[PDB]
Paper text:
In recent years, the emergence of imine reductases (IREDs) has had a substantial impact on the application of enzymes in the preparation of chiral amines of pharmaceutical interest. IREDs are NAD(P)H-dependent oxidoreductases that catalyze the asymmetric reduction of prochiral imines, but in certain cases also enable the reductive amination of prochiral ketones through catalysis of both imine formation and subsequent reduction of the iminium ion intermediate. The enzyme designated IR77 by France and co-workers in a previous work has 100% sequence identity with NCBI accession sequence WP_053252429, annotated as an “NADP-binding domain” from the nitrogen-fixing bacterium [name], also known as a species of Sinorhizobium. The enzyme adopts the canonical fold now well established for IRED structures. An N-terminal Rossmann domain (residues 1–164) connects to a C-terminal helical domain (195–294) through a long alpha-helix (165–194). Two monomers closely associate in a domain swapping arrangement that serves to form two active sites per dimer, each at the interface of one N-terminal domain with the C-terminal domain of its partner.
The structure of IR77 was determined, and using this as a basis, structure-guided mutagenesis, coupled with point mutations selecting improving amino acid sites suggested by other groups, permitted the identification of a mutant [name] with improved activity for amine product formation. Crystals of IR77 [name] were obtained in the P212121 space group with two molecules in the asymmetric unit constituting one dimer. The dimer featured one more open active site and the other more closed, and more resembling the conformation observed with those in the wild-type structure. Following building and refinement of the structure, electron density for the cofactor NADP+ was again clearly visible within the active sites at each dimer interface. Position [name] is observed at the interface of the C-terminal helical domain of one monomer and the N-terminal domain of its partner. Introduction of the mutation has resulted in new H-bonding interactions between the N208 side chain and those of T133 and N156 in the partner monomer. However, the Km of 0.94 mM was greater than those recorded for wt-IR77 and A208S of 0.61 and 0.60 mM, giving 60% of the catalytic efficiency of wt-IR77 in this case. The lower catalytic efficiency of [name] over A208S is compensated for by the greater stability observed by the former. An increase in melting temperature (Tm), measured using nano-DSF, of 8.2 °C was observed upon binding of cofactor, over 2 °C greater than the difference observed with wt-IR77 and 1 °C greater than A208S. This improvement in stability is illustrated in the capability of IR77 [name] to withstand significantly greater substrate loadings than either wt-IR77 or A208S.
Residue numbers in the entry:
A (entry chain A): 2 to 293
B (entry chain B): 1 to 295
Write the structure that this text describes.
Amino acid sequence: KPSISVLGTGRMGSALARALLQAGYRTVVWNRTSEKAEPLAALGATVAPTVRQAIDASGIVIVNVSDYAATSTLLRASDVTPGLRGKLIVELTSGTPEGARETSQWTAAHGARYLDGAILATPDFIGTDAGTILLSGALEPFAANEDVFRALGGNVQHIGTEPGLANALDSAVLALMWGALFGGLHAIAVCRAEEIDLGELGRQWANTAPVVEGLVADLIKRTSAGRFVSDAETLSSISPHYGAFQHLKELMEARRIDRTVVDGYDAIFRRAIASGHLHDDFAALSQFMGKA
Amino acid sequence: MKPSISVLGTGRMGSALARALLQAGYRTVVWNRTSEKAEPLAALGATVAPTVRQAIDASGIVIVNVSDYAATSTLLRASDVTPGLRGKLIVELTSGTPEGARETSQWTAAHGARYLDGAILATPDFIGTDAGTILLSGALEPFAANEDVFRALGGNVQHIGTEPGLANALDSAVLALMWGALFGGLHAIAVCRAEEIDLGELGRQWANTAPVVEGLVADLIKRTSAGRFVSDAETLSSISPHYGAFQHLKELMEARRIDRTVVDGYDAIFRRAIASGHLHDDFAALSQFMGKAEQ
Ligand SMILES: NC(=O)c1ccc[n+]([C@@H]2O[C@H](COP(=O)([O-])OP(=O)(O)OC[C@H]3O[C@@H](n4cnc5c(N)ncnc54)[C@H](OP(=O)(O)O)[C@@H]3O)[C@@H](O)[C@H]2O)c1
Ligand SMILES: NC(=O)c1ccc[n+]([C@@H]2O[C@H](COP(=O)([O-])OP(=O)(O)OC[C@H]3O[C@@H](n4cnc5c(N)ncnc54)[C@H](OP(=O)(O)O)[C@@H]3O)[C@@H](O)[C@H]2O)c1
């Protein structure tokens, strides 16, 4: 089994390193702040002191830093670049499809194979069967080294050959996540302003989460089939949503909780109603997301 | 199956409550502004009152389930009804605001009635099932004295405190979580359409990652309850990498002419947290910046 290098030992870079070690890979790590990489030494990692050293130790280089601008400062420096020849670079950093494409062109021009990924996981999911990572780029590199990706999670998937696909789907899945989390921020604010124990909110969310998961799956299934008009299988219709949402708005007004996000919800509800969708399926709101 | 229960409102949800009281063997008295809508409950064993005042006089417990609190007011504050509320337990299960709950608590007490305010977190189908969820707030004694009645409405009926507005507030909060996930869905769909991604693919990715999102939300609630805004060893994610990736979604929505009213809201909260030193704190730190930037 070949040696794997990991550039970045933040929360997520460390989790990747831990999973490689658990699977019995010689794992070489590097981090701008060397102090943060020590605990992986304790676990069996070799700590490289320099990028160039980490790149020379291994045939596969998994990058997990803040952004592609950072990855550039690391890999595009004169004293690293010549070391990339013959290597597989796996950019698991978050980015834009353009960034994936720009990095694909550049890595190829300097003699290295490339995969661009997006980790659809928190660190606790890495190295578990449920662990999801999306990979895009040439198929051969993923097929030749499949056991390495299998170490990272049971649901690491090659989803296409155009490098930017992982980053594109990622932005969509992150939009879902941000939606749920800022709804959390709204709920937490409402409970704090109304003197509601947040441990109670946490019990209420554990009870309703599975229903809300179904409401979101149904919204996607219906939008894919154009089924915007309410029917017998409708779970969620615009009228009752819009009606109850008035109560949340009134509460947030009274407690001076910021309404910029909910006023956003309200503008989408109102465009759909102004177009006769008041008793249509929630999925009809998918027609009213555009700028103008 | 001992005391008599009246239900005002036989709409979709009012009916389900009445059906569940009958299933449990309660003498059930119903009334509806549209008489015709209450007939099917007669066939099931309900006595149909012709007037509100008659429905209120028949029973010691009055469950109200109408459209809005303005409606409840019309019904209960009428000269011919009000004096009949003396010694009654009124259980307002209509959806409303915490202020509405509070205004009704004050008023009901002034006219000599005990009060509970509720919010139903269930569709009519799940009323009278073990899963059936209803939140109640107000004085505890009335709930504890009549607990078998609430058990009839569902297995997961809960008294959550003494301040009457808690039920309506917790309801709005649970729905804010739901709306957050759904409008996130609307955003994700829109991004897929603009990038020519099969929505069947988004649907498979959601089945794969829903638990990751569910854990992020649970963790955000647990940490906010303990004030843990500083990033630590147990942190799942922190503000800097969130704000970094969120830049890519903003740029994409600009380029594909997707409406940004909602994400610009996210962006203002990210900015206030960073301006106050939380760039590398836990996501939970954003919870400190949900207040109106005003005054
Ligand atoms: N955490 C999650 O749940 C999650 C989910 C999926 C994807 N991701 C993505 O994975 C990446 C890592 O996130 P994380 O949670 O691990 O964040 P983090 O804990 O803040 O880790 C940041 C990492 O980037 C490095 N870095 C920052 N600026 C750099 C620069 N100019 N040059 C070199 N290295 C630099 C840090 O080095 P120092 O330690 O030297 O500062 C560290 O290795 C991000 O793109 C994130 O969006 C995160
Ligand atoms: N359906 C659900 O799944 C669900 C779930 C949770 C919460 N809820 C809440 O339950 C409550 C009842 O809604 P629903 O689903 O039963 O709605 P619905 O089917 O529209 O029933 C509306 C009811 O309100 C009555 N009403 C409205 N205005 C009135 C007035 N001014 N005077 C007298 N009666 C009046 C109606 O009388 P008419 O029959 O004469 O119009 C009818 O009984 C709402 O607050 C709703 O938010 C419903």
